[PDB]
Amino acid sequence: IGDEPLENYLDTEYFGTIGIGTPAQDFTVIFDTGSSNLWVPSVYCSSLACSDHNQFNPDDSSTFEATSQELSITYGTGSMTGILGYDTVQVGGISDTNQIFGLSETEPGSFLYYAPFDGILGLAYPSISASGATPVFDNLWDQGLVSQDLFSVYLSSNDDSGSVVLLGGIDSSYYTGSLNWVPVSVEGYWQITLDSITMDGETIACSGGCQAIVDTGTSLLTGPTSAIANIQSDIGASENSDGEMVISCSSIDSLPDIVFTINGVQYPLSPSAYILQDDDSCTSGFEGMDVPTSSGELWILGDVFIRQYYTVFDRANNKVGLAPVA
């Protein structure tokens, strides 16, 4: 059972420390269940985002094995160009050997520059892995470094400590009730079939069923522009002087619960969960973002949601187990 602590940064981003090479060079990376590749900056990249963070140095690693493969990835936030190579990665107490990861050469963009993390570590299916690059967890399994072919995730709240990624294991102390399993509709992302999104009994979106993915790499609960407008209007969201979705803080106590129905079970969201705030202003936890797929306009169960529900990713039964957090 592997244990990997995640640092909660402003309830918006969750990263952790991994080590690469011999000796081990440290990097903070985001554990993305919406990605499948692992990559960190390197001394070959001269971009501003790279000079801005830790750069991996091949020359100072004795267990490093170079490759002749180009790598490229485009995220909803930024892009990256690199090269591939083998070395030992250390994730949550485990020595992930012969692991193939990427070395940036170009991390263009403003976003990667202000980000606090050096890189990203994908936990999704190898299907969506650029360059056919064997993802980390898949490599941990193949080499029998984890007892079970699954892992669970727990995210803290209110900038707290405790966020953890359990590799090859489940831990009852994080949840209450019984885990309700949900089958994965399409293997690539951790995609699932939503049945509806209601509020006060009336269906306010995804009426008739729709697709969604459980993404830890996204802060807000995302959905098609169209549908989110309605939702926003229902909770009281408004476009202010700074292009943001704000709502009268005090309205929280008033506002009702928005319910998500997954696989026939009801998983509600408290006005305290789908509404982010500080001791100043309260922002809407929702964000409209069209994500075209062969199936349709995709929904994204981001951090807003995952904070309320301990989540298990079962690569053996290809399911997603959920249960209200502890």
Side-chain angles (χ1 to χ4, degrees), residues 139-186:
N139 200 56
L140 292 180
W141 185 232
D142 299 324
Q143 285 180 291
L145 298 182
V146 283
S147 185
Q148 300 184 68
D149 205 7
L150 56 66
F151 56 89
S152 52
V153 163
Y154 171 74
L155 308 185
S156 319
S157 301
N158 314 169
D159 284 73
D160 278 2
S161 164
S163 309
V164 61
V165 173
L166 292 188
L167 308 185
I170 309 170
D171 186 347
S172 312
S173 60
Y174 290 108
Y175 65 95
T176 62
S178 204
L179 278 179
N180 297 299
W181 298 92
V182 183
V184 177
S185 44
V186 193

Coordinates of all heavy atoms in Angstrom, one line a residue, residues 139-186:
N139 N 2.6 1.1 -14.5 CA 3.9 0.6 -14.4 C 4.1 0.0 -13.0 O 4.8 -0.9 -12.8 CB 4.9 1.7 -14.6 CG 6.3 1.2 -15.0 OD1 6.5 0.4 -15.9 ND2 7.3 1.6 -14.2
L140 N 3.4 0.6 -12.0 CA 3.5 0.1 -10.6 C 2.8 -1.3 -10.5 O 3.3 -2.1 -9.8 CB 2.8 1.1 -9.6 CG 3.5 2.4 -9.4 CD1 2.7 3.3 -8.4 CD2 4.9 2.3 -8.9
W141 N 1.8 -1.4 -11.2 CA 1.0 -2.6 -11.3 C 1.8 -3.7 -12.0 O 2.2 -4.7 -11.4 CB -0.3 -2.4 -12.0 CG -1.2 -3.6 -12.0 CD1 -1.7 -4.2 -13.1 CD2 -1.6 -4.4 -10.9 NE1 -2.5 -5.3 -12.7 CE2 -2.4 -5.4 -11.3 CE3 -1.4 -4.2 -9.5 CZ2 -3.0 -6.3 -10.5 CZ3 -2.0 -5.1 -8.6 CH2 -2.8 -6.2 -9.1
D142 N 2.1 -3.5 -13.3 CA 2.9 -4.5 -14.0 C 4.1 -5.1 -13.2 O 4.4 -6.3 -13.3 CB 3.5 -3.9 -15.3 CG 2.4 -3.4 -16.2 OD1 1.4 -4.1 -16.3 OD2 2.6 -2.4 -16.9
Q143 N 4.8 -4.2 -12.5 CA 5.9 -4.7 -11.7 C 5.6 -5.2 -10.3 O 6.5 -5.4 -9.5 CB 7.0 -3.5 -11.6 CG 7.8 -3.3 -12.9 CD 8.8 -2.2 -12.8 OE1 8.4 -1.0 -12.7 NE2 10.0 -2.6 -12.8
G144 N 4.3 -5.4 -10.0 CA 3.9 -5.9 -8.7 C 4.4 -5.1 -7.5 O 5.0 -5.6 -6.6
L145 N 4.2 -3.8 -7.6 CA 4.7 -2.9 -6.5 C 3.5 -2.4 -5.7 O 3.7 -1.8 -4.7 CB 5.5 -1.7 -7.1 CG 6.7 -2.2 -7.9 CD1 7.5 -0.9 -8.4 CD2 7.6 -3.0 -7.0
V146 N 2.3 -2.8 -6.1 CA 1.1 -2.5 -5.4 C 0.3 -3.8 -5.2 O 0.1 -4.6 -6.2 CB 0.3 -1.4 -6.1 CG1 0.9 -0.1 -5.9 CG2 0.2 -1.7 -7.6
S147 N -0.3 -4.0 -4.0 CA -1.1 -5.2 -3.8 C -2.3 -5.3 -4.7 O -2.6 -6.4 -5.2 CB -1.4 -5.2 -2.3 OG -2.1 -6.4 -1.9
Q148 N -3.1 -4.2 -4.8 CA -4.3 -4.2 -5.5 C -4.3 -3.2 -6.7 O -3.7 -2.2 -6.6 CB -5.5 -3.9 -4.6 CG -5.7 -4.8 -3.5 CD -7.0 -4.5 -2.7 OE1 -8.1 -4.6 -3.2 NE2 -6.8 -4.0 -1.5
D149 N -5.0 -3.6 -7.8 CA -5.0 -2.7 -9.0 C -6.0 -1.6 -8.9 O -6.9 -1.4 -9.7 CB -5.3 -3.6 -10.2 CG -4.8 -3.0 -11.5 OD1 -4.1 -1.9 -11.4 OD2 -5.1 -3.5 -12.6
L150 N -5.9 -0.7 -7.9 CA -6.7 0.4 -7.7 C -6.0 1.4 -6.8 O -4.9 1.1 -6.3 CB -8.1 0.0 -7.0 CG -8.1 -0.7 -5.7 CD1 -7.6 0.1 -4.5 CD2 -9.5 -1.2 -5.4
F151 N -6.6 2.6 -6.6 CA -6.1 3.6 -5.7 C -7.2 4.6 -5.4 O -8.1 4.8 -6.2 CB -4.9 4.4 -6.4 CG -5.3 5.0 -7.7 CD1 -5.8 6.3 -7.8 CD2 -5.1 4.3 -8.9 CE1 -6.2 6.8 -9.0 CE2 -5.5 4.8 -10.1 CZ -6.0 6.1 -10.2
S152 N -7.2 5.2 -4.2 CA -8.2 6.1 -3.9 C -7.6 7.5 -3.6 O -6.4 7.7 -3.3 CB -8.9 5.6 -2.6 OG -8.0 5.3 -1.6
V153 N -8.4 8.5 -3.7 CA -8.0 9.9 -3.5 C -8.8 10.7 -2.5 O -10.1 10.5 -2.5 CB -8.0 10.7 -4.8 CG1 -8.0 12.2 -4.5 CG2 -6.9 10.3 -5.7
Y154 N -8.2 11.5 -1.7 CA -8.9 12.2 -0.6 C -8.3 13.7 -0.6 O -7.1 13.9 -0.4 CB -8.7 11.7 0.8 CG -9.1 12.6 1.8 CD1 -10.5 12.7 2.1 CD2 -8.3 13.4 2.6 CE1 -11.0 13.7 3.0 CE2 -8.7 14.3 3.5 CZ -10.1 14.5 3.7 OH -10.5 15.4 4.5
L155 N -9.2 14.6 -0.9 CA -8.8 16.0 -0.9 C -9.3 16.8 0.3 O -10.5 16.7 0.6 CB -9.3 16.7 -2.2 CG -8.9 15.9 -3.5 CD1 -9.3 16.7 -4.7 CD2 -7.4 15.7 -3.5
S156 N -8.5 17.6 0.9 CA -8.8 18.4 2.1 C -9.7 19.6 1.7 O -10.0 19.7 0.5 CB -7.5 19.0 2.7 OG -6.5 18.1 2.7
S157 N -10.1 20.4 2.6 CA -10.9 21.5 2.4 C -10.3 22.7 3.2 O -9.5 22.6 4.0 CB -12.3 21.3 2.8 OG -12.8 20.2 2.0
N158 N -10.8 23.9 2.8 CA -10.4 25.1 3.5 C -8.9 25.1 3.7 O -8.4 25.3 4.8 CB -11.1 25.2 4.8 CG -12.6 24.9 4.7 OD1 -13.3 24.8 5.8 ND2 -13.1 24.9 3.5
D159 N -8.1 25.0 2.6 CA -6.7 25.0 2.7 C -6.1 24.2 3.9 O -5.3 24.7 4.7 CB -6.1 26.4 2.8 CG -6.1 27.1 1.4 OD1 -7.3 27.5 1.0 OD2 -5.1 27.2 0.8
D160 N -6.6 23.0 4.1 CA -6.1 22.1 5.2 C -5.1 21.1 4.8 O -4.8 20.9 3.6 CB -7.3 21.5 5.8 CG -8.0 22.3 6.8 OD1 -7.7 23.5 7.0 OD2 -9.0 21.9 7.5
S161 N -4.6 20.4 5.8 CA -3.6 19.3 5.6 C -4.4 18.0 5.7 O -5.4 17.9 6.4 CB -2.5 19.4 6.6 OG -1.8 18.2 6.7
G162 N -3.9 17.0 4.9 CA -4.6 15.7 5.0 C -4.9 15.1 3.7 O -5.1 13.9 3.6
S163 N -4.8 15.9 2.6 CA -5.0 15.4 1.3 C -4.0 14.2 1.0 O -2.8 14.3 1.3 CB -4.8 16.5 0.2 OG -5.5 17.6 0.6
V164 N -4.6 13.1 0.5 CA -3.7 11.9 0.3 C -4.2 11.1 -0.9 O -5.4 11.0 -1.2 CB -3.7 11.0 1.5 CG1 -5.1 10.6 1.9 CG2 -2.8 9.8 1.3
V165 N -3.2 10.4 -1.5 CA -3.5 9.6 -2.7 C -3.0 8.2 -2.2 O -1.8 7.9 -2.2 CB -2.6 10.0 -3.9 CG1 -2.8 9.0 -5.0 CG2 -3.1 11.4 -4.4
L166 N -3.9 7.3 -2.0 CA -3.5 5.9 -1.6 C -3.3 5.0 -2.8 O -4.3 4.8 -3.5 CB -4.5 5.3 -0.6 CG -4.6 5.9 0.8 CD1 -5.5 5.1 1.6 CD2 -3.2 6.1 1.4
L167 N -2.1 4.6 -3.0 CA -1.8 3.7 -4.1 C -2.0 2.2 -3.7 O -1.4 1.7 -2.8 CB -0.3 3.9 -4.5 CG 0.3 5.3 -4.7 CD1 1.7 5.2 -5.2 CD2 -0.6 6.0 -5.8
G168 N -2.9 1.6 -4.5 CA -3.2 0.2 -4.3 C -3.9 0.0 -3.0 O -3.6 -1.0 -2.3
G169 N -4.9 0.8 -2.7 CA -5.6 0.6 -1.4 C -6.7 1.5 -1.1 O -6.9 2.6 -1.7
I170 N -7.6 1.1 -0.2 CA -8.7 1.8 0.3 C -8.6 2.0 1.8 O -7.9 1.1 2.4 CB -10.0 1.0 0.0 CG1 -10.1 0.6 -1.4 CG2 -11.2 1.8 0.4 CD1 -11.2 -0.4 -1.7
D171 N -9.1 3.0 2.4 CA -9.0 3.3 3.8 C -10.3 3.8 4.4 O -10.5 5.0 4.4 CB -7.8 4.2 4.1 CG -7.5 4.4 5.6 OD1 -8.3 4.0 6.4 OD2 -6.4 4.9 5.9
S172 N -11.1 3.0 5.0 CA -12.4 3.3 5.6 C -12.4 4.6 6.5 O -13.5 5.2 6.6 CB -12.9 2.1 6.4 OG -12.8 0.9 5.7
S173 N -11.3 4.9 7.1 CA -11.3 6.1 8.0 C -11.5 7.4 7.3 O -11.8 8.4 7.9 CB -9.9 6.1 8.7 OG -8.8 6.2 7.7
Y174 N -11.5 7.4 5.9 CA -11.7 8.7 5.2 C -13.2 8.9 4.8 O -13.6 10.0 4.5 CB -10.8 8.7 3.9 CG -9.4 8.9 4.2 CD1 -8.5 7.8 4.1 CD2 -8.9 10.1 4.7 CE1 -7.1 8.0 4.4 CE2 -7.5 10.3 5.0 CZ -6.7 9.2 4.8 OH -5.3 9.4 5.1
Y175 N -14.0 7.8 4.8 CA -15.4 8.0 4.4 C -16.3 7.4 5.5 O -15.9 6.9 6.5 CB -15.6 7.3 3.1 CG -15.4 5.8 3.0 CD1 -16.5 4.9 3.2 CD2 -14.2 5.2 2.7 CE1 -16.4 3.6 3.1 CE2 -14.0 3.9 2.6 CZ -15.1 3.0 2.8 OH -15.0 1.6 2.7
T176 N -17.6 7.6 5.2 CA -18.7 7.0 6.0 C -19.7 6.5 5.1 O -19.8 6.9 3.9 CB -19.3 8.1 6.9 OG1 -19.9 9.2 6.1 CG2 -18.3 8.8 7.8
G177 N -20.5 5.5 5.5 CA -21.5 4.9 4.6 C -20.8 3.8 3.9 O -19.7 3.4 4.2
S178 N -21.5 3.4 2.8 CA -20.9 2.3 2.0 C -20.5 2.9 0.6 O -21.1 3.8 0.1 CB -22.0 1.3 1.8 OG -21.3 0.0 1.5
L179 N -19.4 2.3 0.1 CA -18.9 2.8 -1.2 C -19.9 2.3 -2.3 O -20.4 1.2 -2.3 CB -17.6 2.1 -1.6 CG -16.3 2.7 -1.0 CD1 -15.1 1.8 -1.5 CD2 -16.1 4.1 -1.5
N180 N -20.4 3.3 -3.1 CA -21.3 3.0 -4.2 C -20.5 3.0 -5.5 O -20.1 4.0 -5.9 CB -22.4 4.1 -4.2 CG -23.2 4.1 -2.9 OD1 -23.9 3.1 -2.5 ND2 -23.2 5.2 -2.2
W181 N -20.4 1.8 -6.1 CA -19.7 1.6 -7.3 C -20.4 2.1 -8.6 O -21.6 2.0 -8.7 CB -19.2 0.2 -7.5 CG -18.3 -0.2 -6.4 CD1 -18.7 -0.8 -5.2 CD2 -16.9 0.0 -6.3 NE1 -17.6 -0.9 -4.4 CE2 -16.5 -0.4 -5.0 CE3 -16.0 0.6 -7.2 CZ2 -15.1 -0.4 -4.6 CZ3 -14.6 0.7 -6.8 CH2 -14.2 0.2 -5.5
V182 N -19.6 2.7 -9.5 CA -20.1 3.2 -10.7 C -19.2 2.7 -11.8 O -18.0 2.9 -11.8 CB -20.1 4.8 -10.8 CG1 -20.7 5.3 -12.1 CG2 -20.9 5.3 -9.6
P183 N -19.8 2.1 -12.9 CA -19.0 1.5 -14.0 C -18.5 2.6 -15.0 O -19.2 3.6 -15.2 CB -20.1 0.6 -14.7 CG -21.3 1.4 -14.5 CD -21.2 1.8 -13.0
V184 N -17.3 2.4 -15.5 CA -16.7 3.4 -16.4 C -17.3 3.3 -17.8 O -17.0 2.3 -18.5 CB -15.2 3.3 -16.4 CG1 -14.6 4.3 -17.4 CG2 -14.6 3.7 -15.0
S185 N -18.0 4.3 -18.3 CA -18.6 4.3 -19.6 C -17.6 4.1 -20.7 O -17.9 3.3 -21.6 CB -19.4 5.6 -19.8 OG -18.7 6.7 -19.3
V186 N -16.5 4.9 -20.7 CA -15.5 4.8 -21.8 C -14.1 4.9 -21.2 O -13.8 5.8 -20.4 CB -15.7 6.0 -22.7 CG1 -14.8 5.7 -24.0 CG2 -17.1 6.2 -23.1

